[PDB]
Write an enzyme that holds these catalytic residues in place. Structure first.
Site, PDB file in Angstrom:
ATOM      1  N   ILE A  10       0.856  -1.177   0.000  1.00 37.60           N
ATOM      2  CA  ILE A  10       0.000   0.000   0.000  1.00 37.60           C
ATOM      3  C   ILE A  10       0.894   1.229   0.000  1.00 37.60           C
ATOM      4  CG2 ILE A  10      -1.573   1.408   1.408  1.00 37.60           C
ATOM      5  CD1 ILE A  10      -2.947  -1.185   2.292  1.00 37.60           C
ATOM      6  N   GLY A  11       1.952   1.178   0.800  1.00 36.06           N
ATOM      7  CA  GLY A  11       2.873   2.294   0.880  1.00 36.06           C
ATOM      8  C   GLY A  11       3.767   2.212   2.101  1.00 36.06           C
ATOM      9  N   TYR A  15       5.859   3.798  10.706  1.00 40.42           N
ATOM     10  CA  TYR A  15       6.679   2.765  11.339  1.00 40.42           C
ATOM     11  C   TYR A  15       7.192   1.622  10.476  1.00 40.42           C
ATOM     12  CZ  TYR A  15       4.531   5.382  15.025  1.00 40.42           C
ATOM     13  OH  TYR A  15       4.110   6.437  15.795  1.00 40.42           O
ATOM     14  N   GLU A  73      -8.236  -3.116  10.198  1.00 39.50           N
ATOM     15  CA  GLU A  73      -9.357  -3.325   9.275  1.00 39.50           C
ATOM     16  C   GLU A  73      -8.999  -2.521   8.024  1.00 39.50           C
ATOM     17  OE1 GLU A  73     -13.126  -0.950   9.428  1.00 39.50           O
ATOM     18  OE2 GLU A  73     -12.426  -0.435  11.434  1.00 39.50           O
ATOM     19  N   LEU A  75      -9.757  -0.296   4.598  1.00 40.28           N
ATOM     20  CA  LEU A  75     -10.719   0.638   4.003  1.00 40.28           C
ATOM     21  C   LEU A  75     -10.217   0.915   2.589  1.00 40.28           C
ATOM     22  CD1 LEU A  75     -11.090   1.344   7.246  1.00 40.28           C
ATOM     23  CD2 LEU A  75     -12.693   2.959   6.226  1.00 40.28           C
ATOM     24  N   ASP A 119      -0.227  12.496  15.297  1.00 43.27           N
ATOM     25  CA  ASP A 119       0.241  12.659  13.922  1.00 43.27           C
ATOM     26  C   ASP A 119      -0.894  12.493  12.918  1.00 43.27           C
ATOM     27  OD1 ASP A 119       2.153  13.087  11.866  1.00 43.27           O
ATOM     28  OD2 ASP A 119       2.476  10.925  11.627  1.00 43.27           O
ATOM     29  N   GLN A 123      -3.524  11.265   5.123  1.00 47.36           N
ATOM     30  CA  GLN A 123      -3.084   9.900   4.838  1.00 47.36           C
ATOM     31  C   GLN A 123      -3.613   8.854   5.809  1.00 47.36           C
ATOM     32  OE1 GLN A 123       1.269   9.663   4.583  1.00 47.36           O
ATOM     33  NE2 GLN A 123       0.994   8.235   2.862  1.00 47.36           N
ATOM     34  N   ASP A 137      -4.245   4.576  13.480  1.00 45.62           N
ATOM     35  CA  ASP A 137      -3.004   4.804  14.226  1.00 45.62           C
ATOM     36  C   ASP A 137      -3.028   5.583  15.537  1.00 45.62           C
ATOM     37  OD1 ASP A 137      -2.058   3.259  12.186  1.00 45.62           O
ATOM     38  OD2 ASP A 137      -0.843   4.820  11.222  1.00 45.62           O
TER      39      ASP A 137
HETATM   40  N1  LIG Z   1      -6.481   0.640   7.303  1.00 44.83           N
HETATM   41  C1  LIG Z   1      -5.988   1.027   6.090  1.00 44.83           C
HETATM   42  N2  LIG Z   1      -6.567   0.635   4.925  1.00 44.83           N
HETATM   43  C2  LIG Z   1      -5.895   1.157   3.859  1.00 44.83           C
HETATM   44  N3  LIG Z   1      -6.288   0.927   2.561  1.00 44.83           N
HETATM   45  C3  LIG Z   1      -5.725   1.754   1.483  1.00 44.83           C
HETATM   46  C4  LIG Z   1      -6.357   3.188   1.467  1.00 44.83           C
HETATM   47  C5  LIG Z   1      -5.751   4.055   0.334  1.00 44.83           C
HETATM   48  C6  LIG Z   1      -5.908   3.365  -1.045  1.00 44.83           C
HETATM   49  C7  LIG Z   1      -5.356   1.916  -1.044  1.00 44.83           C
HETATM   50  C8  LIG Z   1      -5.944   1.065   0.109  1.00 44.83           C
HETATM   51  S1  LIG Z   1      -4.545   2.122   4.253  1.00 44.83           S
HETATM   52  C9  LIG Z   1      -4.880   1.855   5.909  1.00 44.83           C
HETATM   53  C10 LIG Z   1      -4.030   2.481   6.981  1.00 44.83           C
HETATM   54  O1  LIG Z   1      -4.378   2.222   8.269  1.00 44.83           O
HETATM   55  C11 LIG Z   1      -2.993   3.320   6.740  1.00 44.83           C
HETATM   56  C12 LIG Z   1      -2.853   4.594   7.441  1.00 44.83           C
HETATM   57  C13 LIG Z   1      -1.769   5.502   7.156  1.00 44.83           C
HETATM   58  C14 LIG Z   1      -0.787   5.168   6.156  1.00 44.83           C
HETATM   59  C15 LIG Z   1       0.303   6.070   5.846  1.00 44.83           C
HETATM   60  C16 LIG Z   1       1.273   5.710   4.834  1.00 44.83           C
HETATM   61  C17 LIG Z   1       1.170   4.454   4.124  1.00 44.83           C
HETATM   62  C18 LIG Z   1       0.094   3.533   4.413  1.00 44.83           C
HETATM   63  C19 LIG Z   1      -0.895   3.871   5.422  1.00 44.83           C
HETATM   64  C20 LIG Z   1      -1.984   2.976   5.724  1.00 44.83           C
END
Ligand SMILES: Nc1nc(NC2CCCCC2)sc1C(=O)c1ccc2ccccc2c1
EC number: 2.7.11.22
Length: 282
Positions: A10-11, A15, A73, A75, A119, A123, A137
C-alpha cells in the site's frame, strides 16, 4: 507469509511498510503494518480494545519470528486521495461537515480513553463507500515513541514541548478541515522553522498575551519575527461564519484554550449535519 498472503504494497507508513493482505484462515482482507520493546507490545495490545465507528479497528498485534506486525481493518481510500480526486469541484460542504463531525467523534472517544494520536494527517484518515470516515493509528506515537509531513503539527510541538495533550489532535484536525474547504494545505511547511513561520504569518506571531508561557517553550527564540495576525475571513473563504468560528477555536495557540473534541461537536456549525454518500472511484 505463514499466516497471510500479500495482495500488494500500500505504501510506507510512519513505522514501516504497509501491505494489503489476506488472512489465510479467514479470507479477510486487511491492512498489515510491519513495524521496523516489551512495553510497546503490552501498550499497543491495549489498543485492540478500542472500538468506535470512527476509529480504524486494530484487529491484532502479531509478534512472531522477532518481528512485529499490526493488523488493521481495511478501508478502500484515504482522505488525501479523495481530496486530490475532488480537486476540480471540491468536496461538497455537507460531506466536509459530515467528515469533520465524525472525525471529532473519533477524537472525543480516543481522548476520553486517554489515547492521543499526535500525527493526524489526510493519509491516515480512511473512508468507505457508505459515507464513514475513520482515524487510523491512534496511540501508536506514545507506544513506539521516536520524508515526514509537518503540515499538521501543532505549534507547541514545533516549539519543542515534549509533553503532549489532546489539543495536538484538534490542531491537526483544524488544519485538515481548512484543507478540505480551500482545496489547498493551510500550512505547507518544508522544514520545522518554515512550518512554524507559516503559522506565524497567518495567525500572528504568538506572545504572552495570547499564549501564556510561550516565551519559555524549549525552542522559542526572542528573535522570531513579529508578524501581525491575518484576517480570518481571508484564510478559508468562502467558509461561513459558523465554520470560521469553529476553525478559529481549533487553531488557538495555547493548547489549553483550544476547543475540545466534545465541545466542538456541540458547535453551531453542526446544527444541520447529515451523512451524505461520497462518490468514490475505486
Ligand atoms: N487501514 C488502512 N486501509 C488502507 N487501505 C488503502 C487506502 C488508500 C488506497 C489503497 C488502500 S490504508 C490503511 C491504513 O491504516 C494506513 C494509514 C496511514 C498510512 C500512511 C502511509 C502508508 C500507508 C498507510 C496505511
Amino acid at each position: 507469509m505463514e499466516n497471510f498472503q500479500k495482495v500488494e504494497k500500500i505504501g510506507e507508513g510512519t513505522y514501516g511498510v504497509v501491505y494489503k493482505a489476506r488472512n489465510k484462515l479467514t479470507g479477510e482482507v486487511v491492512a498489515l503494518k510491519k513495524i521496523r520493546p516489551s512495553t510497546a507490545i503490552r501498550e499497543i495490545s491495549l489498543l485492540k480494545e478500542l472500538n468506535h465507528p470512527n476509529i480504524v479497528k486494530l484487529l491484532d498485534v502479531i509478534h512472531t519470528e522477532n518481528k512485529l506486525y499490526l493488523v488493521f481493518e481495511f478501508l478502500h481510500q484515504d482522505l488525501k486521495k479523495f481530496m486530490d480526486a475532488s480537486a476540480l469541484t471540491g468536496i461538497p460542504l455537507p460531506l466536509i461537515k459530515s467528515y469533520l463531525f465524525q472525525l471529532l467523534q473519533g477524537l472525543a472517544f480516543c481522548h476520553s480513553h486517554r489515547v492521543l494520536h499526535r500525527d493526524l494527517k489526510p493519509q491516515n484518515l480512511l473512508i468507505n463507500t457508505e459515507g464513514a470516515i475513520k482515524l487510523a493509528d491512534f496511540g501508536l506515537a506514545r507506544a513506539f515513541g521516536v520524508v515526514v509531513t509537518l503540515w499538521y503539527r501543532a505549534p507547541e510541538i514545533l516549539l519543542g514541548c515534549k509533553y503532549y495533550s489532546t489539543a495536538v489532535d484538534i490542531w491537526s484536525l483544524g488544519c485538515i478541515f481548512a484543507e478540505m474547504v480551500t482545496r489547498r494545505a493551510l500550512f505547507p511547511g518544508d522544514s520545522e522553522i518554515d512550518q512554524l513561520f507559516r503559522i506565524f504569518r497567518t495567525l500572528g506571531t504568538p506572545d504572552e498575551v495570547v499564549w501564556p508561557g510561550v516565551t519559555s517553550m524549549p525552542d522559542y527564540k526572542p528573535s522570531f519575527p513579529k508578524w501581525a495576525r491575518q484576517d480570518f475571513s481571508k484564510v478559508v473563504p468562502p467558509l461561513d461564519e459558523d465554520g470560521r468560528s469553529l476553525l478559529s477555536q481549533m487553531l488557538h495557540y495555547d493548547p489549553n484554550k483550544r476547543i475540545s473534541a466534545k465541545a466542538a461537536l456541540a458547535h453551531p456549525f453542526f446544527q444541520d449535519v447529515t451523512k451524505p454518500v461520497p462518490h468514490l472511484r475505486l
